[PDB]
Amino acid sequence: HMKLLENSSFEAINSQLTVEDAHIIGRIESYSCKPLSDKCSRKTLFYLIATLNESFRPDYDFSTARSHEFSREPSLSWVVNAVNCSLFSAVREDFKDLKPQLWNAVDEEICLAECDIYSYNPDLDSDPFGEDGSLWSFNYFFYNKRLKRIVFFSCRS
Known part of the structure; x- marks a missing residue:
């Protein structure tokens, strides 16, 4: 199945x-x-x-x-736009330095221009995270089929 790197x-x-x-x-x-x-x-x-x-x-x-x-x-x-808007909202001015660091790291690990990208969006009756009062959430998969590797990025706030 999947092995953590x-x-x-x-x-x-x-x-x-x-x-x-x-x-x-x-x-x-x-x-x-x-x-x-x-x-x-x-x-x-x-x-x-x-x-x-x-x-x-x-x-x-x-x-x-x-x-x-x-x-x-x-x-x-x-x-990229959706993630950046969400994270800025949660992390505020501290996102300024984290932003490039995050995207650089992801790109080096997975090669974003080469990836197929997916999202998971739970049905409301099948949402495991429950009623946690969050205003937004995302669950993105960056899947490089050549590398046989997936970066999973999951946040909410």
């Missing part, structure tokens, strides 16, 4: 994605994909679900997630 830059970014009413805003993680049988006709969906399961163990399971809870993102620019 070490990345010191991501560790540093994760340290800064905090407000420690102290709490963690989000987290960025890198995973290697393990080969699937060719008899699997929907390998991308399989990996997205496996990535959610690995990242959110033992809190939440996504094995019953529906295809329509996932989308392919047509535009890298749109995702």
Whole structure:
């Protein structure tokens, strides 16, 4: 399935994605994909679900997630804009220095111009995170099929 990869830059970014009413805003993680049988006709969906399961163990399971809870993102620019607006809102002036650090680290790990990008958007009746009063949330997957590698970026505030 998915194997967590070490990345010191991501560790540093994760340290800064905090407000420690102290709490963690989000987290960025890198995973290697393990080969699937060719008899699997929907390998991308399989990996997205496996990535959610690995990242959110033992809190939440996504094995019953529906295809329509996932989308392919047509535009890298749109995702960058969406993330930047959200994080600026949560981290404020401290995002100024974190912004380039974050995107540089992600690009070096996954090669953004080469990635297929996806999002997970839970159905309201199937939302594991519950009623946590957040104003926004995102769960993005940057999947480099050549590298067989996925960066998972999940935040809310």
